[PDB]
Amino acid sequence: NDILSRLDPPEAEVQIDRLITGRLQSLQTYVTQQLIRAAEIRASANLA
Amino acid sequence: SFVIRGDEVRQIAPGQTGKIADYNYKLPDDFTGCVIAWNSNNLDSKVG
């Protein structure tokens, strides 16, 4: 909201693209971590 | 096609801010085209 209210749209679009790029990298790292942790948990559940 | 002032030439560009660009002709950010201009002080100028 600060970016949108402060910057003009042509530069605000670039800033939003950088922000959502970093956020989607964070999301996919979190998702892959959840995937490998779920693989470990599923192996433990199969053992149990 | 139109005739503007010498200081107003820059305003016709994607995302520019100005009097002409805001109140007379706004150009979209995702514009696919070209802008062409030339001086005409010998034609569009009366002696008075």
UniProtKB/Swiss-Prot annotation, chain B:
Annotated phenotype, changing residue 46 to T: In strain: Omicron/BQ.1.1
Outcome (variant: residue 48 to S): In strain: Omicron/BA.1, Omicron/BA.2.75, Omicron/XBB.1.5, Omicron/EG.5.1
Domain of life the protein comes from: Viruses
Effect of residue 47 to P: In strain: Omicron/XBB.1.5, Omicron/EG.5.1
Chain spans, region Integrin-binding motif: 5-7
Mutation effect (residue 19 to T): In strain: Gamma/P.1
Stated role: Attaches the virion to the cell membrane by interacting with host receptor, initiating the infection. The major receptor is host ACE2. When S2/S2' has been cleaved, binding to the receptor triggers direct fusion at the cell membrane. When S2/S2' has not been cleaved, binding to the receptor results in internalization of the virus by endocytosis using host TFRC and GRM2 and leading to fusion of the virion membrane with the host endosomal membrane. Alternatively, may use NRP1/NRP2 and integrin as entry receptors.
Oligomeric form and interacting partners: Binds to host ACE2. RBD also interacts with the N-linked glycan on 'Asn-90' of ACE2. Cleavage of S generates a polybasic C-terminal sequence on S1 that binds to host Neuropilin-1 (NRP1) and Neuropilin-2 (NRP2) receptors. Interacts with host integrin alpha-5/beta-1 (ITGA5:ITGB1) and with ACE2 in complex with integrin alpha-5/beta-1 (ITGA5:ITGB1). May interact via cytoplasmic c-terminus with M protein. May interact (via N-terminus) with host bilirubin and biliverdin, thereby preventing antibody binding to the SARS-CoV-2 spike NTD via an allosteric mechanism.
Protein name: Spike protein S1
Organism this protein belongs to: Severe acute respiratory syndrome coronavirus 2
Underlying gene: S
Full-protein positions shown: 399 to 446 of 1273
